[PDB]
Paper text:
In this study, we investigated the expression pattern, structure within the ribosome and effect on protein synthesis of the ribosomal protein paralog 39L (RPL39L). As obtaining pure populations of RPL39L ribosomes from mice remains challenging, to analyze the impact of RPL39/RPL39L on ribosome structure we turned to the yeast, which has only the RPL39 gene. We complemented RPL39-deficient yeast cells with either mouse RPL39 or RPL39L, and analyzed purified RPL39 and RPL39L ribosomes. Ribosomal particles from the WT yeast strain Sc60S, the yeast RPL39 KO strain rpl39Δ, yeast rescue strain rpl39Δ-ScRPL39 and the mouse RPL39/RPL39L-complemented RPL39 KO strains rpl39Δ-MmRPL39 and rpl39Δ-MmRPL39L were studied by single-particle cryo-EM.
Mouse RPL39L has only three substitutions relative to RPL39: S2A, R28Q and R36M. Thus, the replacement of R28 by Q28 and R36 by M36 in RPL39L, that is, of positively-charged residues by polar and hydrophobic residues, could perturb the co-translational folding or localization of proteins. Mouse RPL39 and RPL39L both integrate into yeast 60S subunits when expressed in the rpl39Δ background. The exchange of R28 and R36 with glutamine and methionine, respectively, in RPL39L further increases the flexibility and enables the loop (residues 32–37) to adopt an alternative conformation where the Cɑ atom of I35 is displaced by 5.2 Å towards the exit of the NPET. The positions of the basic R28 side chain in RPL39 and polar Q28 side chain in RPL39L are nearly identical. The side chain of K34, which is located in direct proximity to the phosphate backbone of A351 in RPL39, protrudes into the lumen of the tunnel in RPL39L. However, a partial occlusion of the tunnel appears unlikely as the side-chain cryo-EM density for K34 is very weak. The position of I35, which is facing towards the wall of the tunnel (A351 and A42) in RPL39, is occupied by M36 in RPL39L, leaving I35 oriented towards the lumen of the tunnel in RPL39L in the alternative conformation. Specifically, in RPL39L, Q28 and M36/I35 are found directly adjacent to each other at the location occupied by R28 and R36 in RPL39, introducing a clearly defined hydrophobic patch at the surface of the tunnel. This may influence the translation speed, efficiency or the co-translational folding, either via direct interaction with the nascent chain or via interaction with translation regulation machinery such as the NAC complex, which was shown to bind to RPL39 (75).
Author numbering:
A (entry chain LK): 99 to 147
B (entry chain QT): 2 to 160
C (entry chain LO): 6 to 113, 123 to 174
D (entry chain LI): 8 to 297
E (entry chain LN): 149 to 216
Write the structure that this text describes.
Amino acid sequence: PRKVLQLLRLTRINSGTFVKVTKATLELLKLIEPYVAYGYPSYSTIRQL
Amino acid sequence: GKSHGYRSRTRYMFQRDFRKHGAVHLSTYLKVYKVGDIVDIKANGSIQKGMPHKFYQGKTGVVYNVTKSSVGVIINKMVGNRYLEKRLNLRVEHIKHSKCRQEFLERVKANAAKRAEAKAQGVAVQLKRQPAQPRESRIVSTEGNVPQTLAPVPYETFI
Amino acid sequence: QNPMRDLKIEKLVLNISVGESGDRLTRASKVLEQLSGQTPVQSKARYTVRTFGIRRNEKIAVHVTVRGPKAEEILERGLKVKEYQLRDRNFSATGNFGFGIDEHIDLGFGMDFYVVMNRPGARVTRRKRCKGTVGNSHKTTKEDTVSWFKQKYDADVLDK
Amino acid sequence: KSSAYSSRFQTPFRRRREGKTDYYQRKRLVTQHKAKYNTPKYRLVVRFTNKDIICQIISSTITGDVVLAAAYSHELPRYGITHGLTNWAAAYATGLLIARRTLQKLGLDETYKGVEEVEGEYELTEAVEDGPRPFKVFLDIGLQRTTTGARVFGALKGASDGGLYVPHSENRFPGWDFETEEIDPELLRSYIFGGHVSQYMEELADDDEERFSELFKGYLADDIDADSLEDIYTSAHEAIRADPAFKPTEKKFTKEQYAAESKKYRQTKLSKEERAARVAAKIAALAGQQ
Amino acid sequence: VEGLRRARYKFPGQQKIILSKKWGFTNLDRPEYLKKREAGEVKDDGAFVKFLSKKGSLENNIREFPEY
RNA sequence: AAGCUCGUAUCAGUUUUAUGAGGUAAAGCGAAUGAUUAGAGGUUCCGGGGUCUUGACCUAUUCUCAAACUUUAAAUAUGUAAGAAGUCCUUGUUACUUAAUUGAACGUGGACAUUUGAAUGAAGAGCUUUUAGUGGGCCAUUUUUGGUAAGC
RNA sequence: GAGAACAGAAAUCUCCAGUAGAACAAAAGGGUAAAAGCCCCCUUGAUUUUGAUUUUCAGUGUGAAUACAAACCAUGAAAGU
RNA sequence: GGUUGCGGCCAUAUCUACCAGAAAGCACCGUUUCCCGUCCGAUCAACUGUAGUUAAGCUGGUAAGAGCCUGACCGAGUAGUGUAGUGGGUGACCAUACGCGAAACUCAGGUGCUGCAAUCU
Ligand SMILES: [Mg+2]
Ligand SMILES: [Mg+2]
Ligand SMILES: [Mg+2]
Ligand SMILES: [Mg+2]
Ligand SMILES: [Mg+2]
Ligand SMILES: [Mg+2]
């Protein structure tokens, strides 16, 4: 899981990135599940970020 | 004391398959191997000569030498913190052609065919594989498929 | 259907079982040379028992095999002593039969006579290439050989 | 036979169950040096059935064996041999025929003409310099036992004398004595022209006339005496070296006509409905209070 | 039930007494067992029984279970 | 620590797709081997009392098991591949190889550019010399051996 | 398993069934049926020269083992070994 | 479509019990001067294709056949297992969350396919 977090550029607490959803990235999210919170962002959230 | 002989711990690894004892079929000896071919190693317990060590069981390598009844195979082995090149002399009974790349050859052929087909009229032939994509929208009809309600069942012993 | 499946004598074997070896053994094997016209062979003991007086590879017994029409002649000579009378036993479940005698001067040391029955076409079991197995209807049965022994020699089967 | 016995039973190869192929011998016959790649190894198959001799040149492939050339003893009547289609002289002629048929097909007929002065001599087809090497095949005898004087070595002699290089030794040819390590060319030459049969005719006729007529009935009907089979054997060898090309027998009927007649004598499987019908009928009879 | 209750004191740990819905020591429910025996598919073989299947040669399945 | 050759080339304690290897968990014993409970139907010129019983195998069933048993057989780990050192068309060299310009290996010339052959990332990648300390360890979750157990 | 004078649970002979329940110098595990087992025939390759490779591994040594090259031989009808 | 020689995969091909097989082929079968091998021309060698036979081998079909093969949301998302919690419980062990996922059992269907050469109402 430590390696997967580095590959997603999540190297410190409260860091965030966008991920495109495919079969290759869904399995990545499974490995780091107890370390992250993720969901589906709306247009308003993307604009303000 | 401890025992670390050449064939140590190979009780089940080198056994023949169930109801598959006896002589080797002739198709093993009729296949041709060339330098640069990719082969995988699986020892046969009934041929005691030219047999690989147990470490190389289930490994894949590249042919570098061809002899009368055997081939030379190159294997990369991890020792310590690096990889060392190992060269094996194995009889053909213990090897077979690998399909890890034979399936890759046809994709190269199809890419050339698709590139030439769209060369005269098409742009962006898109010769790249892509992972499985999220499903698109759809409409589910209930005509003849009215949903059936389900509920949890009570505990029963039925021993 | 009996067009060709006629019972026939395959072989006749003259077995002499001797406890010891040496001068006694060659004396017994000497009779078979003039009794059958062919030189016999000697069989060594399989192992040692220390009770019957035999040891391993001691060459205890002698036997000889004869076929053709020169065997049915001596088969007749072996039946005169038996007076054409055989028990309901002595007949194997595979169609064979045999009997033993106590003296050889009566024919013209005890001996054992065993006769093997077969039918034409038995070569399929003995041939090297495409070796096969005789079918059930073509096999030799105990009742078949007993009847065959009744028809010729005008012999009879004993009690039971 | 218990169910456990059948479950754990391992059946041999089909050609081994039938009893026709020795796989221990086959492996060493067909395995090719891996550094020679797709170079084929050719086997001279010689087989002896009742009243027939079969000679073939065969190479091995994954999908199955491939025949290069064939020669049968039932084709010998075109060359002047009508009797003794399975004797020693027939084997030599059939061996000679396959050698000539193969070389002509490969285009190497002009070179390696064999030996035209056959006198029972042991020799091999040597190569010619600055030219192609002779075509090489290995003798395949199958399950035949190796004994000196066996006809399979007679067919070997014909193929070698026909121009095909076949490696062999002379200790299995007739006329070889174990005491002295040399071959007798005089006795060997007798067998190539049916000398052992011509000798038999003269001895049997003067011994028992009743036996002679029953055995050699065909010779009497065709006006062939004891000292004439050598002449036709010589002429047959001359004819083989002239037109050895194979020709197919004219087919009176076609495959469809052959298939149609044969289908009437074949028993067909039963469908699942009629199989269920048979068991249902049996229940109504055996389990229906008669 | 009382006999099995008294046996629990001899054992360590916790044990439970359950009233089985099978027929005796067979692996069939009581209504299911009654269905088969009325059809002549059950033969008494010692203290246990043998059943009649839909498979096998009819020559053997007829002498066994003649009533069926 | 000293740097050196280069400037994203190529790589990865990761996923995916394709293709291998394994005999542990579980499972199995009316499947082999070895243990094991209970009847039932059969078998003797081949166990022994008695003129009929107990044993011994045979056949069909039945209860229960295996670190040094097994047909079947996971999960987690694990090998290789996903292109330019590649693919295709034509034909040069040899003392090797072929019945044979047959093949093998290495080449000349022509055709195909970076949606150039999956995903994500890449305080750059590759490489060399030299030398310090260390070579008594211990603990926690899970797997696990000896032992009644132990802060063993 | 069914048979054959002495002959019996075990002597020798015959047939049938027989996936190996035998055998293969030794411990155990693998392997093997027109064999790697049993019998018979012929032999010395258990030979000569010097390298490469696998295992233990520091990728040192020693032991053991694998595949070739250049010679000289054994065996077989031969491929081969 | 039949059959023979040489095969490929190596039971859908094996095993048990029956029945059928035109043509050709295969086979059984006849003989012992010759090469050759046996206690035995049984096996093996040679000769004849003549004297006979489809009886067997062989091939095909039959069986609520044994075995074997394939499939099934049959059993079963069960057993087991990766990851997680300052979850439950004295403990033994167990539930839940995000994933992977058997075997037996049950039922249904199937019972060799096929390459090269030659030959045949
Ligand atoms: Mg060795
Ligand atoms: Mg051989
Ligand atoms: Mg293990
Ligand atoms: Mg377990
Ligand atoms: Mg210290
Ligand atoms: Mg934690």
